[PDB]
Amino acid sequence: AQNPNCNIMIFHPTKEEFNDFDKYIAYMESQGAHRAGLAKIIPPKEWKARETYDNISEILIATPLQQVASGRAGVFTQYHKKKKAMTVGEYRHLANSKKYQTPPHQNFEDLERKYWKNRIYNSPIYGADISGSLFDENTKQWNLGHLGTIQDLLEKECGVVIEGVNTPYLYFGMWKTTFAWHTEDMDLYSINYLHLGEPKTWYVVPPEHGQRLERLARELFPGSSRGCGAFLRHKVALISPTVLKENGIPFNRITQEAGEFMVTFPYGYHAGFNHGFNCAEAINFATPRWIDYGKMASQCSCGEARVTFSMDAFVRILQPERYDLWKRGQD
Ligand SMILES: O=C(O)CNC(=O)C(=O)O
Ligand SMILES: [Mg+2]
Ligand code: NI
Ligand SMILES: [Zn+2]
């Protein structure tokens, strides 16, 4: 078996290998990359996402989110308080202000220590889930707005045509902005490109050990667990690497820098934080290997999760027994 320790693998495709997206994902899996839950892909030196990022300041962040924490330094939840709209130029200025800027630090490890020590005492503002793309339309390789759709994948594999669309989302981050422990909707893959700015640190649990993380989360967030059998779908819970280690949860960590792709694999729980002002683009995707994960994916039906239009068809076709209950949660 390839990659039996479930390490995060890093790939350096050639420009020739970068032509066929599906083929390269399959190649990574042939080397055991999926066992980690997360892989890094460094594009060939000849590739670029777009010419320059000099003209992005007029993008609107319609609903910036202030991420307010509750709990203890290593075990906390966050809720999202809506703020007034601001442009990316305004957001960048805010990120760099004394109140929100990255503190002096020695290296990534020092900054990581500061993050887990101090995160809960601040409330950074995130521009998340903004529909759009920063890939040049002429970028032919690994253009996250030109991927084969999940709906077409499901049709190719299972023969059923379904409604729905999926398009990329932009994320504008600042120091301490946080993504909570989660797997993707329907345990899909995701791919994330860091366009510009400061790094993003990721934590990930191997898919084969995801239920260990779930069990710990139930113990650490007991009220939330009683409220919903899939409350990590709410994407609000954080658990530090120290607490994971104390509880014997297998995980890995890696820092993504500007110009690098990360792929998360089906049922790979992940969480992380931004180092400073940055912009990432991400989208969900599927492969034939995803279908069995989609069939088995947990669902939130308590009403909190509330997801995209396109998830309806996924649940309807892959999980018909769960569909009625899930849809009640939607409404
Ligand atoms: O970048 C973020 O804030 C969150 N991204 C993801 O969870 C992802 O790409 O799957
Ligand atoms: Mg602009
Ligand atoms: Ni994700
Ligand atoms: Zn729920």
Author numbering: 11 to 341
What did the original publication write about this model?
We demonstrate the power of the method by applying it to the most demanding type of changed-state study, namely crystallographic fragment screening, which attempts to observe in electron density the rare and often low occupancy binding events that occur when a relatively large (200–1,000) library of weak-binding ‘fragment' compounds (150–300 Da, 100 μM–10 mM)1819 are added individually or as cocktails to a series of equivalent crystals.
Z-scores are assembled into spatial Z-maps, and clusters of large Z-scores are an objective and statistically meaningful measure for potentially interesting crystallographic signal—events—such as a binding ligand. Equally importantly, Z-maps also make it possible to identify weak changed states (for example, low-occupancy ligands) that do not yield strong difference (mFo–DFc) density. As ligands—but especially fragments—invariably bind at sub-unitary occupancy, we generate an atomic ensemble model that reflects the crystal content implied by the density correction: the changed state modelled from event maps is combined with the ground-state model, with initial occupancy of the changed state set to 2*(1-BDC) (discussed in Supplementary Methods).
